[PDB]
Structures are given as structure tokens and as C-alpha cells.
Amino acid sequence: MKEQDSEEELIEAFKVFDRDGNGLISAAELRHVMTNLGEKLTDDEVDEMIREADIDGDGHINYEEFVRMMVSK
Amino acid sequence: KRKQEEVSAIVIQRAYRRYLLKQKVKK
Ligand SMILES: [Ca+2]
Ligand SMILES: [Ca+2]
């Protein structure tokens, strides 16, 4: 139920996910974190997660998209 | 094709859960 308030935490995950520190998560950046976190994902499996989060259709997950993906059911 | 709209969400949700359980040492 607590999603909108997760901002405090969801915001911390960004800095950890964004290795480039540019403010944008790509398919290669996300998959990179999943590996270290302990999750194996293929180039296709990852790309499928990016599109679901990509609201602008640019191929990158931003802050507004990060919360949406987390607050998606 | 099943899309995995729900399953895909768990893969990301679970991944974050571990990060919290690890970071959130509490004590
Ligand atoms: Ca980046
Ligand atoms: Ca986008």
C-alpha cells in the first residue's frame, strides 16, 4: 500500500542504480545492478522491463518512471 | 507470448526487497 511515500526509499535506490550518476537508467545499467543484487536477466528480459517503465519512449527510466514502476500494482 | 506484466514486476520488487533487508540492518 505504501508506494507514494516510498519516495524516501525509492529515491535512494536511484543513486544506487544510476552508476553514471546522470539521472537515467538504461537497459545495460539496470541489468548490471540485477547481477550484483543476485538476479540473472537476459538482454531481452531486461529490455522488456525498460519499456514497461519507459513512459516517454526514449529507452531510459527516470524518477517519475521509477515511482510509477514501483507503484504499478 | 504472455508479456509477464505481473511477473516482471515481482522480479524488480523482490530485487528491491533484498536491498532493503540488507541495508536496513536496524540493529
Ligand atoms: Ca546512468
Ligand atoms: Ca522515459
Count of the separate structural domains present in chain A? 1
Number of Cα atoms under 13 Å in the Cβ half of residue A53: 26
Q: At a CB cut-off of 8 Å and minimum separation 6, what does A26 contact?
A: A50, A59, A60
Q: How far apart are CA A29 and CA A39, in angstroms?
A: 13
Are A37 and A30 spatial neighbours (Cβ–Cβ below 8 Å)? no
Q: Closest approach of chain B CAs to the CA of A37, in angstroms?
A: 7
> 536477466: which residue's cell?
A41
Number of Cα atoms under 13 Å in the Cβ half of residue A63: 11
Q: At a CB cut-off of 8 Å and minimum separation 6, what does A66 contact?
A: A10, A13, A14, A25, A53
Q: What is the DSSP letter of A6?
A: G
Does the beta-carbon distance from B9 to A72 stay under 8 Å?
Answer: yes
Technique behind this structure? NMR
Cell output for A17: 542504480
- H or E stretch including A4? none
User: Could you give the 3-state DSSP secondary structure of residue A72?
Assistant: coil
Q: How far apart are CA A11 and CA A66, in angstroms?
A: 9
Amino acid sitting at position B26: K
Q: Which residues of A touch B21 (CB under 8 A)?
A: none
Domain of residue A53 covers: 1-73
Chain B residue with CA closest to A47: the answer is B8
Q: At a CB cut-off of 8 Å and minimum separation 6, what does B14 contact?
A: A39
**Ligand-binding site membership of A47 (annotated):** no
Q: Closest approach of chain A CAs to the CA of B17, in angstroms?
A: 10
